Each structure stands twice: as C-alpha cells, then as structure tokens.
C-alpha cells in the first residue's frame, strides 16, 4: 500500500547536514500523528511501498530556526566548544546547552536544538507499509515487530 494517515511506515534513511552524514538506520513510525518532523512526513505522504527518493527538508519544517536569544554569555564561574552541558532547568525539564567559545571569564552557550537552523538532506527507502493495529492507534505510535 501507500503512505497515509494511520499507516505504520518502515523507512531506511540516511540523514546529511551541510554535506556530511549525521545519522542513518531503519525506523517505523505511525503516519499522521506528528511522530516525524513535518517536512519528512510530508515528503513521505502518498509514497508507495518500495519507493526511493531524496528529500530536502529546510529548518522551518524540521527542528525550527536558530533562536539568537538562545545564545548567551555565561561566566566561567557558573560552570561546575562542542561542550554539552545537561544543566538543570530553572523550573523543570532540563535543557542541554552547548558551548561554542570561551574567552577568559566569558563563555558562550547555546540552548537551541543541535539541528536548529540546519537544512536536512534525506535519502529514503519506503521498506514496508501496513495499517496500524488498534493498539497502535490508541498509543498514537508504532509498535515495531
């Protein structure tokens, strides 16, 4: 069958950003329940099982724009590039920061999601398409194999 609302879709994909691959594998998701990033799900819409395709999905339809407000300078004294800090939220739900630069007392931190502001490039194979079982529809997600 073909990808649509309430189908469980199994894809084999590669993900590349700025020309470099960041991730790959096989996943199964329930289509039409906001389980995938919007742009990818849109690109999958209507595809027949067995289809292969590329899809460019811009930041606006993936992990959203990079909030320049999420970049801040914190004191070196406040800490206990590429540095990932899982520092405690102020009220709940921690937010991983990543340091981009540090000069003296000053440290530059970033609250944004890693892929924020990034256009994503996907190579995709639609491996299987079937209808969701009633349990999957209840939980609102795929129960793979």
């Amino acid at each position: 069958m073909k990808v649509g609302q309430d189908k469980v879709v199994t894809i084999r994909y590669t993900l590349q950003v700025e020309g470099e691959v960041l991730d790959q594998g096989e996943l199964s998701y329930l289509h039409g329940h906001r389980n995938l990033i919007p742009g990818l799900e849109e690109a999958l819409e209507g595809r027949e099982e067995g289809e292969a395709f590329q899809a460019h999905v811009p930041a606006e339809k993936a992990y959203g724009p990079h909030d320049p407000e999420g970049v801040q300078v914190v004191p070196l004294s406040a800490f206990p590039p590429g540095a990932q800090f899982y520092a405690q939220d102020m009220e709940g739900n921690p937010m991983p920061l990543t340091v981009v630069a540090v000069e003296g007392e000053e440290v530059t931190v970033d609250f944004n999601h890693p892929l924020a502001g990034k256009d994503l490039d996907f190579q995709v194979e639609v491996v299987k398409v079937r209808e969701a079982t009633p349990e999957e529809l209840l939980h609102g997600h795929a129960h793979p194999s």
């Binding site: 993900l15 991730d23 594998g25 996943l27 998701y29 389980n35 995938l36 990033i37 990818l40």
Partner: peptide, 4 residues
C-alpha cells in the same frame, strides 16, 4: 521527534 524522529529521526532519533
């Protein structure tokens, strides 16, 4: 969410 996904790809994760």
């Amino acid at each position: 969410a996904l790809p994760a």
